[PDB]
From Swiss-Prot, chains A, B:
GO biological process: intracellular iron ion homeostasis; iron ion transport
Co-factor binding comment: Binds 1 heme b (iron(II)-protoporphyrin IX) group per dimer.
Alphabetized PROSITE patterns for the sequence: BACTERIOFERRITIN, FERRITIN_LIKE
PANTHER family linked: BACTERIOFERRITIN
Name used for this protein in its record: Bacterioferritin
Binding site for Fe cation 2: 52, 95, 128, 131
Keywords: Heme, Iron, Iron storage, Metal-binding, Oxidoreductase
Subunit structure: Homooligomer of 24 subunits, arranged as 12 dimers, that are packed together to form an approximately spherical molecule with a central cavity, in which large amounts of iron can be deposited.
Gene source species: Escherichia coli O6:H1 (strain CFT073 / ATCC 700928 / UPEC)
């Protein structure tokens, strides 16, 4: 019914890619956390991978509605941590860069008056910023407490 | 309780990577098929992504049990098709190469007498070969019938 802007489509595909990587990374990390007996951390990672799945859905829906083609695009490795701090750091690196990409896209969607795409991305960004926030606190505590002291209060 | 062979672990991580890519690709393709009104094709792609998820689980379980670390490793783009034939071809390219990697790994697991890893991979290979087979038939029919004639008998 309506072919959308092609740079918007190109942005949506870039963001979709970000989500797929986030999905795979939190799936792995969640399983590693669980293997260690860190219920709380596994719980949040697991639910996060579910959310990112949901974002990915929204993105694909939107590309298809705009008569665009899903088109990844080199996702890019992929930094599975070897300890909790490392894992959370890679996660936060992924999230921050994702948020950036979202902010640029939202800008461009608005310039070209794709308010539907813009508003969808804004809703998603809000989600991103909450997890970013959560992540920055955990890493703060590991810093302040020390990784071992931090873990043991999880257990 | 038991640190496993490190080349086996390295192989398991390579195969895990293959699964993650397969998961992301069939998730996308399944959604594209569905957007076109191809219930049967979407149904099989969707269920396939579920299976590959299950393989990924088995792999991560096994790496963790062998005191190995999940470690991807450049997944590699990623070839989303633009029509059904193209999509199925990319899928089959992915599957065949995956099967190959499995066969090498199974060989090596057996040489070093990791029968548990070997047997797990054999079970997985059997799954791979069935979908490969299914895929080779669909592509045969598209060839014999022509893509349009093929589709319309789906609908
Ligand atoms: Fe997201
Ligand atoms: Fe997020
Ligand atoms: Fe598989
Ligand atoms: Fe398969």
């Amino acid at each position: 019914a309506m072919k959308g802007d092609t740079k918007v489509i190109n942005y949506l595909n870039k963001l979709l890619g970000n989500e797929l990587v986030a999905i795979n990374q939190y799936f792995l990390h969640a399983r590693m956390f669980k293997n260690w007996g860190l219920k709380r951390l596994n719980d949040v990672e697991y639910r996060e991978s579910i959310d990112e799945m949901k974002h990915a859905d929204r993105y694909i829906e939107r590309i298809l509605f705009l008569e665009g083609l899903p088109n990844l695009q080199d996702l890019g490795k992929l930094n599975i941590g070897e300890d909790v701090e490392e894992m959370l750091r890679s996660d936060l690196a992924l999230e921050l860069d994702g948020a950036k990409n979202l902010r640029e896209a939202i800008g461009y969607a608005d310039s070209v008056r794709d308010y539907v795409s813009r508003d969808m991305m804004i809703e998603i960004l809000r989600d991103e910023e909450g997890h970013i926030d959560w992540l920055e606190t955990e890493l703060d505590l590991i810093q302040k407490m020390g990784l071992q002291n931090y873990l043991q209060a999880q257990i």
